[PDB]
Every structure is written in structure tokens, then in C-alpha cells.
Amino acid sequence: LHHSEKKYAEEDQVQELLKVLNEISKTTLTLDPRYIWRSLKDLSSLRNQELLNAETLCFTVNVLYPDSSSFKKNLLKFITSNHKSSVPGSAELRNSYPASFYSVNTEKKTIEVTAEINCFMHLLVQLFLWDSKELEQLVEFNRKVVIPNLLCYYNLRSLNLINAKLWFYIYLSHETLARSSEEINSDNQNIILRSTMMKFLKIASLKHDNETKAMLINLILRDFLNNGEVDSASDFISKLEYPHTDVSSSLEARYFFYLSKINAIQLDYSTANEYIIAAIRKAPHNSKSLGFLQQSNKLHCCIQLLMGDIPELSFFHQSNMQKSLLPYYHLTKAVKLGDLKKFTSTITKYKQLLLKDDTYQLCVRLRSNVIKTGIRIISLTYKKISLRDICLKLNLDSEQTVEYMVSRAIRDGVIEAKINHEDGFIETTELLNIYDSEDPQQVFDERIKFANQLHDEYLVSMRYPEDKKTQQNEK
Amino acid sequence: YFKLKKLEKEYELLTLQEDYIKDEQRHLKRELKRAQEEV
């Protein structure tokens, strides 16, 4: 019963291992194993539940263990292991074959098979940790191992894609440990974690690997947002070390999502508005990306309110996420209607929900935007309006208070009007007829560059699938 | 290890040969468009 269970999953694990084993030996095929490793994460997660944990026990016995002797015992000690044929050397799948990692040449140390075996061994260990949700000592014990090993081992172009997915598990398992319980040893692990990301990023710069460097950047930018220090992130994004070539579909929208949050407190909404829009188009529409689309669309609606312009409220309805978008509808309604008491009572009840996404701090500053939008609505209606007519509609304090607030709207060129103190009315200075200026040419010059930018993208992509088929023989 | 330093010079040769054709093809396609409109 239990004997046939261990041989079934181990044969499928070697079958998938031999596919990427022979491809990395000749030249560089690494593009092909990268596609296989994408599905390997999903196929292994479903397979870990079946046949219990015994699929990874005989896999270490098959190959040679450089560091992994005590790692499997320590990983299986917390679950109160039940020992069945636990003596090492029970299952031998090698039997002296070239693709089987021939033993005599391996035991005599005349050849080194540890490079591809050990780096792949750490991948299967991190998968069971996230599947079984093993925390506390098991998280810190594996961190003391992989990091010193990556410093001694020098990865080639194909080998840099192995640990690229391991850095995500180190940061993911660390954040779940801090939020679960607060202990004195929690931040001691984060200090070394923050210093380790900067040391390995220095080496990956010369490797020119797209997935390796881009995976760390999105993990480093998230750490800066938790501490709330832009000075570390400001110079970090100015170097432009983020590879734009191949992020696949995972890192497309993750990079632009951080720039929208950083520039939100920079008081520049021109560039931040484009980053949040590009994050929506680059993010997949599937169910696994719904967690990202939930937080991203909530940030886009908050940026528009900070710009002074009322966005489209139809997104709060036709979308299927409106259950979580209900608190944000009353915020825009209070800013549009200009009611002072409605905005104060709206943020009071939903303050608990705004604490999770940390958007309540931006909602406090929406108190000013209620007046910013209210002035824009009343100004467009009446070109010449009396000074006391504004205080009657918005129920303001006095005439000296509104005189200061209207002067704040034309600061950046929003309203573009003038205040006449002696005449007693505010007159709009916008005569339209802007076509006589150079403004139409300013937009058309970018459309030509944007059209040729899409041309330059299509300019050079054809031959990539044609390299394999034209070089190989065809019927 | 002999082919490592031998192909090092070939790397610059393959780059220049592709650049010389890329520079000459711009002047070649100009005469191609003139013959099409002439017919």
C-alpha cells in the first residue's frame, strides 16, 4: 500500500526533472525550462496534498545530499513523523544509468552533479512550507541555509532562474510571521532580510537576467512602503535598473502599482495617474489576479478625487466588485455635492474598513478636496458671480474665508479666473478659442511619437518563433 | 577553452557585418521605391 504510493509520485518528479536536465547541458536553452517552471508551481502544489508527504522523502535518497541530510528530518520533526522504511538507501532508482546520475562516478567525486541537484532541492522545500503553512522555527532555519549557499554557488544564465522564485518565498513567509505574532526576535530577522536583498541585487546586475532583478525590485519597493521612507525608494527608482524586456505576465502590473503609491504623496498626480491606468491593462482578468485588481481599482478612484476632478461613477456599478466599492461612492458624492457634514459622517463609519488598505490617511486630506471641487462646480456655472453668492450655496463661514479659498483654486491653473475686490464679483478669464495657440500642436507631436512607438515595438518582433522552425528540417 | 578566445574576435565581426548590411540596405530600398513609382 504505502510502497506503491512513494514510487508513483517520484517517477513523475524525475520525468519532469529529466526534461529540464538535458536542456541546460547544451548551450543555453534556458528559455524553454522557464516556461516549464511556470506550470511546475501549479502541478506541484496539487501533488503535495496527494500521497501525503512521502514523495519528497525518497527523492533525497535517490540523488546525493550535500546539505539535505538533516533538513528533511527537521522539516518532518514538527509534524510528529511516522517512520516507515525510514532508513536511508531503501529506494534506489539510479541503477547505473547516464541520465540516472551514475553513482560510481558520483561517489568517486570525479564529476560534480551537485550544481543542478542542490539548487533544485531548495525549490521543493519552499513549496511544502507554503502548502503546509509551517511557521516559527521552520521559517528562520531555512533562511540561514539558502542565503549562504547562494553566495558560495555562482549561478550561470540558466541557474539564475532557480533562486529567482526562492526570494519571493523568503519575503512572503517573513511577512506572515510578523502579522501572526509580535515577538522580540521578529525584527532581528527583518534587519538581515533588508541587507540581504541589496547584496544579491549587486551581483544580479552583471548577470542581466530579466526575472532575477525584476523579482527583487517589487519585493524591495514593498518593504519601503511599509516603513514609509521615500528617500530609499526615490534614488532606487532613478537608476532605472528594472528590466523591461521579459517580465512575463506576473510583474507587468506589479511595478506600476508601486509608482502610483509613491507619487501619491509627492503631490504630482500627472505621472501617477498613468501608472495606475497601465497597471489595470497589464493585469490579467482571471480569478488569481482578482486580489490585485481589487486593491488597484480602489487606488485609482482615490487618485482622481485628489486631482480635483470628479471621475466616472459608472465603474462603481457595472463592475462585479461593487460590494467592496460601496464606501468610495459616498466619498465622491460628498465631494461633488460639497456637503460639509456628509463627508465627516461618511469617513467615521467606514474608518475601520479604510485601515486595512491604509487609504484613510488620504481620505483625511479629501476634506480640502470638498472645497476644491465645490468651487469648480459653482465657477463654471456663473462666469460673474457675487462674493456673497458662494457662501449661500455652500454654507461657508464669511466673505473673507471664501476670498482666500477661491485664490487657492487658480494656483495650478485649474479654474483660470480672477477675483475683483473693488467690483465685488469673481470673473472667469477663460475665453476658450485655444485653437489659435500652439496647444493643438503640442498634443499632435506626442501622437506621432506614440504611433511610432507602437511602430518601433512592431518594428522588430517577428523571427522569434521562426528561429526554431526554419533551422529544423520541415516536410 | 581555445574557442572562447577565438570566437571573441568573431563576436565583433558578426556585429559589424550585420551593421554594414543594415547601413547599405537603407540606400538600396530608396532606389527600390523609385522603380516602383516609375513603372
Binding site: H208, R463 | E8, Y11, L14, T15, D19, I21, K22, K29
Partner: peptide, 28 residues
């Protein structure tokens, strides 16, 4: 081979750029 391996990407980069511009010339 630190410089040889680093400059190897320029070989595949310029090769894929020139071949895809030959199809336009071969079409003309």
C-alpha cells in the same frame, strides 16, 4: 570569460534585429 559572456547578449540582440529587417528588404 567575464567580458565574453557579458557581450554575448549583443550577438543575439543585433542578430535578431538585422534578420527581421531583411524580410522587409526581401519583400521589396
Amino acid at each position: 570569460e567575464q567580458k565574453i559572456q557579458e557581450t554575448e547578449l549583443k550577438i543575439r540582440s543585433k542578430t535578431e534585429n538585422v534578420r527581421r529587417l531583411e524580410a522587409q528588404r526581401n519583400a521589396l
